[PDB]
């Protein structure tokens, strides 16, 4: 992640954050339609789940200048995901769906350059989570 990518993340988050509740919920709707098999893994209220996901995305943005500082928390999160029945192959599907959902909700407000930066940040988070 270069300084240009870090900037795009911070800038796009200013448009994501005010829309975070809707984006998170759209993401679940899209995920469950795209991959009908994974919805069985989500066993708590989706409203609450969405808030948790978007909170962590916020934490990634807040620490975007030092992501290594987040290795521990991301490792713990990946470990809990194993306990939820999540496997490595789920991660690209969720990443694709999340990025497509942000794109859908924000439209032109979300640039290709921003989407590319978020792709890399997600890939990094998923790498740490799956070890």
Considering the complex, state which of residue 42 and residue 75 has its C-beta at the smaller distance from ligand HEM: 42
Radius of gyration of the chain measured on its C-alpha atoms: 14
What is the per-residue binding string for ligand HEM in 34-73, x denoting contact by CB under 6 A?
A: ----x--xxxx----x--xx--x-----------------
Which 13-32 residues touch a copy of itself, going by CB under 8 A?
Answer: 21-22, 25-26, 28-30, 32
Question: Which of residues 2, 14, 45, 83 is near a copy of itself by CB under 8 A?
Answer: 45
Whether 25 contacts 105, CB under 8 Å: no
What is d(CA 110, CA 15) in angstroms, rounded to the nearest whole number? Answer: 8
Write out the binding residues for heme b.
43-44, 49, 80-81, 84
Q: Which residues make up the interface to ligand HEM (CB under 6 A)?
A: 38, 41-44, 49, 52-53, 56, 77, 80-81, 84, 86, 90-91, 94, 122, 125-126
């Amino acid at each position: 992640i270069d300084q240009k990518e870090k900037e795009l993340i911070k800038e796009s988050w200013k448009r994501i954050e005010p829309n975070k509740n809707e984006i998170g919920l759209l993401f679940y709707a899209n995920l469950f339609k795209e991959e009908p098999t994974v919805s069985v893994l989500f066993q708590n209220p989706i409203s609450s789940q969405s808030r948790k996901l978007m909170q962590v995305l916020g934490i990634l943005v807040q620490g975007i200048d030092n992501l290594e500082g987040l290795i521990p928390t991301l490792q713990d999160l990946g470990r809990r995901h194993k306990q939820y029945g999540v496997v490595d192959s789920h991660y690209p599907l969720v990443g694709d769906c999340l990025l497509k959902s942000i794109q859908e909700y924000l439209g032109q407000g979300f640039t290709e350059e921003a989407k590319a930066a978020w792709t890399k940040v997600y890939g990094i988070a998923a790498q740490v989570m799956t070890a």
